Design a protein around this ligand. Structure first.
Ligand SMILES: O=C([O-])CC(=O)C(=O)O
Ligand SMILES: [Mn+2]
Length: 541
């Protein structure tokens, strides 16, 4: 692999890394290796391996402390580093995390945007990352973010593709599947929940939080809605109930109220996921801890705060002498955090910039990722000045869309509309009047055609016809209409294309990212395993 490696090194030395400025290669010291005090603690991963998922949920229930999930490997750098954290950097500290923090309920290391980004921009396989980390991290439960009826892709897939993906992901190491739907619609969740149960893994059924349950002017997503959705989620056999707060909208008094009402509505342990965008993540988690939440999502201090999760280290001290403590070795966590502080410096080209708590997110409930994508695709098309009012436009088109849940990929729908109207000086009242000739963004017509599922309360019918002029509108699961996929023929059609017989993970990767996977194969032909280079060499030559 010498010739491939020198070819890549020459390419980056001379033409720079695509998508970032050709900064000169900097001198970096070796990241600090942690000094750890180690104990053998019989992690939840061991319980799952030995006695199944029901044993794990019994363990979670009988834990007095609040358990932690480390999001450093997925959501922290999705929020902060544009999902660019490389496997080479993970593997330098994976064993330290696994051995030094056995108290961790799980590490969220897969799913979300990482699957697409690894292939597309890092030229490393997500499956390879999962395999290497699983070998390095044998005692920590691995958690993935699963998007309901579309596993890690965007388009809806037939059910067999989803089930085969779940089986392969569970065979290759994933233990906990946080399954969610972009509109909190059960029919998109239940099949994949069943598949996770059948593969012997833990199913986390997720309710996306939106709006404000303690504000009576927004009764659509009131607390009763959350309780009913929770009851029905518990009716599907999900092992855990997660409460995804993708935008950090959950506020401390609502979190305590919400968790407590869910707590006496269902019997599943509750997993709380919040983002620190508003600066209230720690107090929200503390409020949920009082209500009796079981697991909370945190990130290491160096990749925490801002649009990421609240700090793993700070939440410990926030609870140190209260009735409920955090289950973590905080001294070991502080040592591991030194490694992450240092390797973050390699990812300077991907940093967002000066970050301070922003409560504007309470008004524009756009998640952090959707926030950067609107920074990256408003100014780039000449509207960076107006970004502070397209945020207001984002607020408006959500209300005209019927006040929908804004998480991937439904948050891309709202942003596409709002950016489109500002791009054409369209107010709300003209799209109802001059809307019969406008060409709405593809993501908007597809959403109003039912391709993302059915939102709560349906569509604003009059507005829907204005959008989907002469197109079929479906009202059932989009996957029910999905074109059938036969894996054996996909294996044949792929083997002829990549030059070798693919494993079962490469087949599903090809199915859910056809062009991306094949573009990754081309680059592996040209450059080979660029995943083995260190980040400064990978990025700057
Ligand atoms: O916060 C969101 O929009 C959900 C998320 O992490 C993903 O699905 O990649
Ligand atoms: Mn998140």
């Amino acid at each position: 692999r010498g010739t491939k490696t020198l070819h890549y090194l020459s390419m980056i030395t001379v033409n720079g890394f695509p998508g970032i400025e050709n900064t000169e290669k900097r001198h970096f010291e070796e990241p600090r290796q942690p000094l750890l005090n180690l104990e053998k603690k019989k992690t939840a991963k061991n319980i799952l391996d030995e006695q199944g998922a029901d044993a794990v949920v019994d363990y979670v229930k009988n834990t007095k402390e609040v358990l932690l999930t480390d999001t450093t490997l997925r959501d922290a750098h999705q929020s902060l580093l544009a999902t660019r954290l490389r496997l080479q950097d993970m593997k330098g500290i994976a064993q330290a995390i696994d051995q030094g923090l056995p108290e961790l309920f799980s590490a969220e290391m897969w799913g979300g945007a990482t699957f697409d980004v690894a292939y597309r921009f890092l030229n490393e396989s997500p499956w390879y990352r999962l395999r290497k980390l699983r070998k390095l991290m044998p005692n920590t439960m691995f958690q993935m973010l699963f998007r309901g009826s579309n596993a890690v892709g965007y388009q809806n897939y037939p059910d067999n593709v989803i089930e085969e993906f779940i089986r392969v992901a569970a065979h290759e190491g994933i233990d906990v599947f946080r399954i969610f739907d972009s509109l909190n619609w059960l029919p998109q969740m239940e099949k994949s929940i069943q598949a996770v149960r059948d593969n012997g893994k833990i199913a986390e059924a997720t309710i996306c939080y939106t709006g404000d349950i303690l504000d009576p002017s927004r009764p659509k997503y009131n607390i009763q809605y959350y309780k009913d959705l929770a009851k029905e989620l518990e009716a599907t056999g999900a092992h855990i109930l997660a409460v995804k707060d993708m935008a950090g909208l959950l506020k401390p008094q609502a979190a305590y109220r919400l968790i407590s009402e869910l707590k006496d509505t269902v019997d599943l342990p509750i997993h709380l996921h919040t983002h620190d965008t508003s600066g209230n993540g720690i107090i929200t988690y503390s409020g949920a801890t009082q209500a009796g939440v079981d697991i909370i999502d945190v990130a290491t201090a160096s990749l925490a705060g801002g649009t990421s999760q609240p700090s793993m280290q700070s939440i410990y001290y926030a609870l140190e002498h209260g009735p409920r403590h955090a289950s973590i070795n905080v001294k070991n966590a502080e040592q591991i955090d030194h490694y992450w502080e240092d390797v973050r410096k390699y990812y300077a080209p991907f940093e967002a910039g000066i970050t301070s708590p922003q409560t504007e997110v309470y008004m524009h409930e756009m998640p952090g990722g959707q926030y950067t994508n609107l920074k990256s695709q408003a100014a780039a098309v000449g509207l960076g000045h107006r970004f502070d009012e397209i945020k207001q436009m984002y607020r408006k088109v959500n209300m005209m869309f019927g006040d929908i849940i804004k998480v991937t990929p439904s948050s891309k729908v709202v942003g596409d509309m709002a950016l489109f109207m500002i791009q054409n000086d369209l107010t709300e009242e003209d799209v109802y009047a001059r809307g019969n000739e406008l060409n709405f963004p593809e993501s908007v017509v597809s959403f109003f055609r039912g391709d993302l599922g059915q939102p709560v309360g349906g569509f604003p019918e009059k507005l829907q016809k204005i959008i989907v002029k002469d197109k079929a509108v479906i009202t059932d699961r989009p996957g029910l209409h999905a074109e059938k996929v036969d894996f054996e023929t996909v294996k044949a059609d792929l083997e002829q294309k990549i030059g070798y017989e693919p494993g079962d993970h490469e087949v599903i990767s090809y199915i859910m990212y056809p062009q991306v996977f094949l573009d990754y194969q081309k680059m592996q032909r040209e450059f080979g395993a660029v995943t083995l280079l260190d980040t400064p060499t990978f990025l700057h030559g």
